[PDB]
């Protein structure tokens, strides 16, 4: 019931096979390629921790208007980290997490002007 995950920076984590399998990617590495240590070439250790707790908290289961209070506080981190989570959720294919992180960015956009947007997200003005 325990599988071993490995971050890009080398650290190893032992997570339950079910929690770990919320990551389609991880799941498919486990099942069609009997990989025990499962290296995640893109996710570093700091990020895997978050990912793991997120999956753990959801082992048992728009708007921004429906983001579970827990998930909200979970995403209470700096852009840097937020950016890394969206990317990590995409590579690992953990729908739910990808789901909440996306709405979270969405909400950061809602209400602002393109300019405000360019500023909070450090986006270059292509038309200039």
């Amino acid at each position: 019931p325990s599988i071993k995950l490995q971050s890009s920076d080398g650290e190893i984590f032992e997570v339950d096979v079910e929690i770990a399998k919320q990551s389609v990617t991880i799941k498919t590495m486990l099942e069609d390629l009997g990989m025990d240590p499962v290296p995640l070439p893109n996710v570093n250790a700091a990020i895997l921790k978050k990912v793991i707790q997120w999956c753990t908290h959801h082992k048992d289961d728009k708007r921004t208007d429906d983001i579970p209070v827990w998930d909200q506080e979970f995403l209470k981190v700096d852009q840097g980290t937020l950016f890394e989570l969206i990317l990590a959720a995409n590579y690992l294919d953990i729908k739910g997490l990808l789901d909440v992180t996306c709405k979270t960015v969405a909400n950061m956009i809602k209400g602002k002007t393109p300019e405000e947007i360019r500023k909070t997200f450090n986006i270059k003005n292509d038309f200039t």
Partner: protein
């Protein structure tokens, strides 16, 4: 070291954008080119069956004609389209011709397109039920004529008000010959219409709401003749009827609802 959002994969941007509501989406398309293209993505508009200026925060802002075109060109399944007040172009109108199954179309106040585009658009909407093509200031008799020449027979509610000098008896005649099912007909501000045209309305056997407000050359007293429309139920005839005769008119056709 600035967070590298400019590198976020297109997949993700779409995912994010899929979380945004239509009006919001239009905003972001102005953030940067990568976003501008993605916001116009097929996956986000493809299914729309309704689209109206009203429901899209574009009150305080001007939608680049260019971008409006890019988004609408992604819709073929609209049954309700309102671009009321918006300034268009031919490319955009010709593109609207995709939605063959339009039921309701509102272009009042629109401008910037030709009599030809107009024709190609109405011609394609052959199951159109109600059209509001009023006050498109931008146009001439060419347009008006096109309008009455190509609105589908399926039409029941039509509003062609605002063409003081470009709409004439003959045009109402055409309209009438072609659209027997009309129920609501507004021809307000059709200053070229006089009581001689009244006979034409008698061929619309289902017309119950007619409106001739501000048709300044209609001799008020001659209106009585319209109560002779067997199915007529309401008559908007504002600004051309002096109270004196207005009260008479009302007493002569007590079954009518006149304002």
């Amino acid at each position: 070291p600035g967070v590298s959002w400019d590198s976020l994969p297109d997949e993700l941007l779409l995912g994010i954008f899929s979380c945004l509501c239509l009006p919001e989406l239009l905003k972001v398309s102005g953030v940067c080119k990568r976003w501008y293209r993605l916001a116009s993505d097929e996956s986000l508009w493809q299914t729309l069956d309704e689209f109206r200026v009203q429901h899209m925060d574009l009150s305080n802002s001007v939608i680049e004609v260019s971008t409006l075109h890019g988004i609408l060109s992604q819709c073929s399944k609209l049954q309700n389209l309102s671009l009321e007040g918006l300034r268009l172009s031919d490319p955009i109108v010709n593109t609207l011709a995709k939605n063959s199954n339009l039921v309701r179309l509102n272009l009042s106040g629109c401008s910037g397109f030709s009599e030809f585009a107009l024709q190609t658009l109405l011609s394609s909407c052959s199951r159109l039920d109600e059209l509001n093509l009023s006050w498109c200031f931008d146009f001439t008799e060419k347009h008006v004529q096109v309008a009455v020449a190509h609105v589908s027979e399926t039409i029941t509610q039509l509003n062609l008000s605002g063409y003081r000098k470009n709409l004439q008896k003959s045009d109402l005649s055409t309209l009438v010959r072609r659209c027997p099912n009309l129920v609501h007909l507004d021809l307000s501000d059709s200053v070229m219409l006089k009581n001689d045209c009244f006979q034409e309305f008698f061929q619309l056997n289902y017309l119950q709401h007619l409106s001739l407000s501000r048709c300044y050359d209609i001799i008020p007293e001659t209106l009585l003749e319209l109560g002779e429309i067997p199915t007529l139920k309401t008559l908007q005839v504002f600004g051309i009827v002096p109270d004196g005769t207005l009260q008479l008119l009302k007493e002569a056709l007590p079954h009518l609802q006149i304002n």
